[PDB]
Symmetry: D2
């Protein structure tokens, strides 16, 4: 076992200060000392999204670099990621599991995917294994020779696992979920890559425990952020 292949993307809530009541208090500018549902839906209907920002959630995310790229495009979040300049990188790499769709149909612009055969999945695993094993063998060879970490890592693939903290408020999370989940009955159907979708679904599940009224209204109003 020269390297570790994994197919999992992990998201854990580290900390938070978020509830449906926090929205109602901000919207009302509440002083020290069905109505929650009605208020939260009123804000979604009127696109008064600002009260949904007065909260926070922090997630620990472990995902391949190509997926962390998609996550880090959302400029309303805060991130802090482990550095390959700073620390040697572990030989853990992502490959898609047996249920991941492997084939494409239609125009490139459609991001429409379809199932692959059992030999498609085998070919992906064979090809990834060879490429990742060679990449990590050369990375460690360079490190052993005394080459700086920030240069040695040039040979590592975008499937290399990384880990980070990602913090959002609920408004930023709903904008992220609108773009990074593919829901055919949403107001807008987005076509994100499956891997960042896996992140987003786990974030949504965690959020729905903290803010179940807002989570329900968000889907009811077409999964767009107010």
């Amino acid at each position: 076992p020269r390297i570790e292949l994994r197919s999992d993307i992990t998201v854990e809530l580290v900390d938070s200060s978020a509830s449906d009541l926090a929205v109602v208090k901000a919207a009302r500018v509440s002083t020290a000392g069905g109505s929650t549902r009605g208020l939260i839906r009123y804000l979604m209907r009127s696109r008064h999204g600002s009260p949904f920002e007065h909260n926070s959630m922090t997630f620990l995310v472990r995902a391949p670099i190509f997926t962390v790229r998609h996550l880090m495009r959302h400029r309303t979040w805060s991130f802090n990621e482990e550095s390959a300049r700073y620390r040697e990188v572990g030989a853990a790499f992502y490959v898609p599991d047996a249920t991941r769709l492997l084939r494409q149909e239609g125009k490139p612009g459609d991001y429409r995917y379809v199932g692959g055969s059992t030999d498609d999945h085998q070919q992906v695993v064979r090809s990834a294994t060879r490429a990742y094993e060679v990449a990590f063998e050369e990375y460690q060879r360079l490190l052993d020779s005394g080459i700086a970490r920030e240069i040695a890592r040039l040979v590592l693939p975008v499937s290399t696992y990384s880990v980070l903290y990602a913090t959002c408020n609920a408004r930023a999370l709903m904008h992220f979920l609108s773009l990074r989940t593919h829901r055919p009955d949403a107001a807008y159907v987005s076509h994100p890559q499956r891997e960042i979708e896996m992140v987003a679904e786990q974030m949504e599940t965690a959020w729905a425990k903290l803010m179940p009224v807002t989570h329900e209204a968000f889907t009811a109003f077409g999964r767009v952020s107010p």
Copy 2:
């Protein structure tokens, strides 16, 4: 009857913030040093991103001209009571007797100096007269059925407003660097006194939740990382 007040109030409504939150974010917790050592190193190296993984929510009550200064900080979240939606209460700010009332030097130097007893009585007299007329006309307009969003056009920028203001500690430190006047800081900023009163109460509340960060912030010249 109008009410004159001189207070600016800040109350911490809610928070999720601690120096350990910074340490965890910096280390991505899942150097063999200390919380002080790591927070100083981030502060001096301007590695400010770990200071964002937290939140504080303040309830602020201040005159409109001071809320304007608060709401220029685009890294924060705000939600304020609306005069289009609800009639405005008759509370108006006037400076207290400690406030500096005169200016010297160039306009861009914002250098204020003490006023006399006469100066302060003059300010209270003019303000009382102007705000009594404004509120009397606001009330007359509302009484004759003019819409609230139009009637408030006569109300002064000293009218109090209340809002929630939410930040993370990086955004708070950036705000403090600009909205407190500290002779000894790396950059001496010249904010108006009233927004500095808001800033100071925010900083007092913050130093309770993140004392190591608060101390490193002043140690390095009050510049946000």
Copy 3:
């Protein structure tokens, strides 16, 4: 007389670098235009619409400047009353402005005022603004600092600012700050900020007419 009353809200485009071709080049990462801009809006790929800029000079009363300044994706710089004495120019609504309201506060439902309602607004505004500005000048004349003297001035006092946006930020602003029955969402901005937004949209339509047409075709929502 000692004060100036005006009812106009002005917007002028000061400079720009914005075109539909700038959107295409960003989307294609360049080293029909209508078809591509429509595809971006349908797919909410709004990022290519940020690679441009427009700078507006806006003159409006403070209560409306507050509404404009809530849009955090823009850049602003406004004349300071801490720095400079304030001029005696104050806003009052013109005769076409709707002056009364019905229904619940959250409906924002305005209805016409009579000729009398409008005279009453002008009479009360003149009285209040006159006293404010008399006291402001009295305090300035006594040597009280500019930043304290202006405590008496009303939220109707005019201010002036530069406001710079890219097309994505302008569309997000127009979706919230115009009331349009051809939009996906009927928003209820105050008429004065809507006057700023209408002039911005008019000037933007000359620079990026494909994008301006696609914005309305897709429901007046920012991509």
Copy 4:
């Protein structure tokens, strides 16, 4: 198809609307022992009145390896649009450092202190990178030829693979990026970015200094801190 190794990082200014006059106009909006423009800009720079420097725009075309694009894209005040590997097959161009790059590191990880490598160090880098990039690309093409979707085939490509994007900033955002992404031992804050993002930053700065020379002079005069 053969791979291509390159060491260059390129930045071109695609378009702009930025000048020192645009700052002065934004700053003085209204109803010195030298030029009033340099006077005003120096005053804003030292007073950290940065807002006036936002009323402009510059758009760059940048070509760089993914690991360096990652550094550029952390700056949330900019706008970006990058070529996509989900959308289009990736070209066979891969970054390797040139012979002048420092290849060794001394001291603590947080010091970011780099020192010269030997001729043998450079050769060993080119050797290992060549071998890894050739196997990656051969496997990427094998996957593509097999009909595997391009968003999954690119899993095997290294972070040295070149990408291309537009990056748009105003001058305030550019100054904040230059303070962090250039290593200037004279600056008020000495930052230790990776050399490759520093190459991007130096080219951007050279372009910007032609569009806004008084601003650029003031930024350096005051310690390379964004207002």
